[PDB]
Design a protein around this ligand. Structure first.
Ligand SMILES: *C1(O)O[C@H](CS)[C@@H](CS)O1
Ligand SMILES: *C1(O)O[C@H](CS)[C@@H](CS)O1
Ligand SMILES: [Cl-]
Ligand SMILES: [Cl-]
Ligand SMILES: [Cl-]
Ligand SMILES: [Cl-]
Ligand SMILES: [Cl-]
Ligand SMILES: [Cl-]
Ligand SMILES: [Cl-]
Ligand SMILES: [Cl-]
Ligand SMILES: [Cl-]
Ligand SMILES: [Cl-]
Ligand SMILES: [Cl-]
Ligand SMILES: [Cl-]
Ligand SMILES: [Cl-]
Ligand SMILES: [Cl-]
Ligand SMILES: [Cl-]
Ligand SMILES: [Cl-]
Lengths: 574, 574
């Protein structure tokens, strides 16, 4: 009967190596075989409520005649084997899709959907080149684990994401015990303490000393902390280079304040020429999809639109798994929540056609130190050669406030930056108050002329919308670790005192700066614990004691010969 | 097979009047009949993800061999008939339980669980005295709809809750159309605008003029706005007086910042002598169960503990529907999240045994106006007869900040009160800085000696924890509408200038005021839009234009002959 279904629990699926992963089968009451959707989950396939609110009302897929298979990843919950993040997911996904394709209830069409880790696993599945996989729908995900979520395009560790997540997995590994242990109760306590104070956990030096996390999940040190360079161990798990060879349709969701935003958007650009790719980007952080934050409310239309998302996914799967060639009629290619005007808007492509990548140059009379300095932004090159100078002290890094934080206060993306505006290592440059709106929608970067007294250091750039009432709301930001200025692969040190031109990848945003606002950029050398703190030594940063680290006199050069700027993706619609 | 189940959609269940309500059946694969759990839902039985995250992982009940029935209430989504809130729910619940009891797959034991409206409906079901109903689990609910959520023990309208909710129902009635209409698109827009600005919608005078909401849901005016008195129309739907005659076990959940908190706790006290009642109270608001707020973080243990809740519910139902007499071994009678120390704690009863209901008297040199006045709180009666005086102007009411707000900024319960501390109509009284902790856990009220130049006005009282850093965090609050000082049923006006002793029911809290903090009480005559604004005329408030309203010179009397105080439920544990 239409609308009706059954659920079978703990169906054991054998992988190539004989290890068995558990799945749940949600199968419609059907005459013959049906199209199937697979979800690969490390947070317990039974616990559907935990993730699904960030995704789709997918029981609608089942009522509409799709089968849905939810799987425990290797070594977790009801699955056999050992869990190590990422390393087994290509093969296990391949083996699982094959098994599904071989079932009596599968009609030869398979798709995938899901958020975060349930999104990363879809890219890992799509590179298997299993013919029967017809579409994927990776939400808030990445195809390059170095670039998101563990490190970044800047070559700094996303330490708060690392320790926060490891503590969560740790908690699970315990609560899911094969056989309970005496140290479980106390370990649980230590894990909660990390999660109540991720900045605290990130502050212990040497960073590589993680007695609890290293014991529960050795990968935290063995893979992540020990591999600062984007090396073979990372390229081994990266999917990105293989994406351009695929012809798999992908429905891709991202959030402007989501740790994955940069990589999510990159995946869209990589697949769009070869297959039907779609893009939806709302003003969300990884853990806050509500549209509401402490100092910024985006309106009820900003709340993750779960029902519209369900409808969109269903049309997408109807088109690619069912061959319904008109199923996506009237569905936009790209749908963005444009902040400022706080409205959803349809677009034909990402990057937007008719993006004007426009330099806004750093300038001003006197020092740009603090928000009350004389720092300016202007579309004209500055007339006079100047330099802003500050001391970066690793023992006092600039605290993280909003942006793309994941586990350390990850629920306030558009955070008011005022609490750090009186600090001497936070350089501020702003336009005059705008009398006409300025829309910035696209990828954002800065080109800075910099110098240090140290042989390595960081430089950060942050785009900020300054409201009439004084709120200085964060939009997007990035970091460059100077040893990685040229490459994430073969780092080299710098000469103290030499001026370098460096690029800062500031990810992406969509914001209209309305009349009465200002475009503002904050420049510094730290952003902790979003990123780990540079020791200013040129050493193996994660192996250094705080005491071993050095302060740095860092300098931003600006003027005719050193035209430091932010490149803004200007959109003009009249 | 154990763990396995099937789901049948849109099974139509006939009521006594021939109208049919739709249900979904989640039935385990079972030899014979099983115990059954019923959930009555006005937000679409299909949409399980919307509410369940506030409740339980109840698929675990189904995997463990319970059937679960989820029903669309009369006139919504897949059900037939006309929707009017509350009025049909006693009979429909009765008819539905009977139908379930008659099914081949029902073993004669029925239970219920659910949150909010899904909680209110359980009290409405429990008064039918259907023998087969063995237990209920009403979360964030009430058995007296006047007292929560529509009015309150003070006799003021909960206007923000009223309009916010009506707009939500309105939105549903549209999105669920039998036959789509030309005005749907525009109506949808107007509904969103109310929900983005509930304070704005609440500000239109006369309040009873609601062209959109009155048309979509006439009950908004016909029942709620038109019945300011706790009259026969309210008593008709109230369950409270019948609760003391029941012998139904009840697992009751509440939140310290939840609009229903006062009534949730009252239901526990009413059933505890006659049946196995349980209580769980976390630091949540109706729409924020995370434990995280703009200016107050309660720690990860405060996050609604959905898995522990599932386990507790399962043991509860195992005990009462399955007759497993040891199923609740080691489960506490009462479990409270004690704020301040920010820890869960078990207790044997609510109110706590060894509560010392202790007067803290208003005093001080000079006026108590603003936070920089000389207002004090002390366990000693004030020595000298004084009075604090302010003007209450309905056109400028004291704005609502946290507390038990539902739809107008209902996600910041423990709000910092500082933004209203310089106001002249906000009287502030505080203890000295504490050097030893003071625990306040229980029902809270104030006894004030008051006078007005008006023949009716409001008086509000708010309990506040003042932190070392200056944060003035709201805990609990209430209001008395003076015409209802003696009774909610037969209001009478007051004499301008006469001193009255009035009670303010300030609901309940659990907080340890730690060393370095202060106990603080804010007194005023408005709290908008949590409550509607008194017009100070003695008229039908909801029918008055702003222009028709009067200002009031209100006065709080304090001293030996007028010992105004807050009664605090002091707990002492050494
Ligand atoms: C998702 O499930 O949360 C994590 C944030 S770091 C991420 C890990 S790949 O996946
Ligand atoms: C719940 O579902 O939300 C409402 C808050 S006013 C309440 C109405 S009785 O039930
Ligand atoms: Cl089978
Ligand atoms: Cl393994
Ligand atoms: Cl805002
Ligand atoms: Cl919109
Ligand atoms: Cl354009
Ligand atoms: Cl200026
Ligand atoms: Cl110099
Ligand atoms: Cl140079
Ligand atoms: Cl049947
Ligand atoms: Cl009807
Ligand atoms: Cl706090
Ligand atoms: Cl605790
Ligand atoms: Cl006690
Ligand atoms: Cl004092
Ligand atoms: Cl006088
Ligand atoms: Cl008197």
């Amino acid at each position: 009967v239409d609308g009706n279904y059954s659920v079978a629990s703990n169906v054991m699926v054998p992988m190539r190596d004989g290890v068995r992963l558990a799945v749940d089968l949600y199968r419609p009451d059907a005459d013959g075989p049906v199209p199937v959707l697979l979800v690969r989950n490390p947070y317990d396939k039974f616990d559907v409520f935990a993730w699904s609110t960030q995704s789709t009302n997918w029981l609608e897929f089942v009522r509409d005649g799709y089968a849905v298979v939810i799987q425990d990843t290797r070594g977790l919950f009801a699955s056999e084997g050992e869990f190590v993040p990422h390393v087994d997911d290509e093969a296990d996904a391949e083996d699982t899709l094959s098994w599904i394709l071989e079932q009596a209830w599968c009609d030869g069409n398979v798709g995938m959907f899901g958020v975060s880790y349930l999104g990363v696993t879809q890219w890992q599945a799509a590179v298997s080149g299993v013919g029967g996989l017809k579409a994927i729908a990776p939400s808030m995900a990445s195809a390059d684990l170095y670039r998101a979520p563990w490190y970044g395009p800047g070559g700094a560790l996303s330490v708060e994401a690392l320790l926060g997540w490891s503590a969560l997995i740790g908690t699970q590994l315990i609560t899911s015990r094969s056989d309970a242990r005496p140290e479980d109760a106390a370990d649980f306590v230590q894990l909660a303490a990390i999660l109540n104070d991720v900045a605290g956990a990130a502050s212990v030096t040497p960073l590589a000393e993680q007695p609890l996390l290293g014991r529960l999940i050795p990968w935290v040190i063995d893979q992540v902390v020990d591999h600062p360079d984007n090396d073979e161990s990372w390229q081994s798990i990266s999917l990105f280079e293989r994406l351009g060879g695929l012809a798999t349709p992908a429905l891709i969701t991202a959030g402007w304040y989501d740790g994955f935003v940069g990589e999510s958007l990159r995946t869209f650009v990589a697949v769009k020429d070869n297959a039907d790719a779609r893009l939806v980007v709302g003003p969300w952080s990884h853990s806050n999809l509500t549209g509401r934050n402490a100092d910024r409310k985006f309106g009820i239309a900003a709340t993750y639109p779960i029902q519209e998302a369900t409808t969109m996914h269903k049309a997408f799967f109807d088109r690619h798994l069912r061959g319904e060639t008109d199923a996506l009629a009237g569905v936009p290619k790209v749908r963005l929540f444009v902040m400022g005007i706080d409205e959803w808007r349809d677009e034909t492509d990402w990057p937007l056609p008719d993006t004007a990548y426009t330099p806004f140059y750093l300038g001003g009379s006197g020092a740009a130190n603090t928000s009350t300095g004389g720092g300016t932004l202007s579309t004209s090159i500055s007339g006079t050669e100047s330099a802003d100078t500050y001391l970066y002290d690793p023992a006092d890094p600039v605290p993280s406030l909003g942006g793309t934080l994941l586990f350390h206060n990850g629920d306030n993306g558009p955070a008011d930056q005022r609490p750090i505006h009186d600090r001497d290592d936070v350089l501020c440059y702003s336009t005059e108050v705008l009398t006409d709106p300025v829309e910035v929608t696209g990828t954002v970067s800065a080109r800075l002329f910099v110098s240090s007294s140290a042989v390595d250091t960081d430089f950060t750039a942050k785009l900020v919308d300054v409201f009439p009432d004084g709120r200085a709301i964060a939009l997007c930001d990035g970091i460059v670790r100077m040893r990685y200025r040229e490459t994430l692969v073969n780092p080299t040190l710098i000469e103290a005192g030499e001026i370098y031109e460096v690029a800062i990848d500031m990810l992406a945003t969509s914001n209209v700066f309305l009349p009465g606002h200002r475009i503002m950029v904050q420049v510094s050398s730290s952003n902790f614990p979003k990123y780990d703190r540079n020791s200013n030594t040129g050493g193996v940063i994660a192996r250094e004691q705080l005491e071993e680290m050095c302060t740095a006199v860092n300098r931003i050069h600006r003027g005719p010969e050193h035209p430091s700027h932010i490149v803004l993706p200007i959109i003009k619609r009249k």
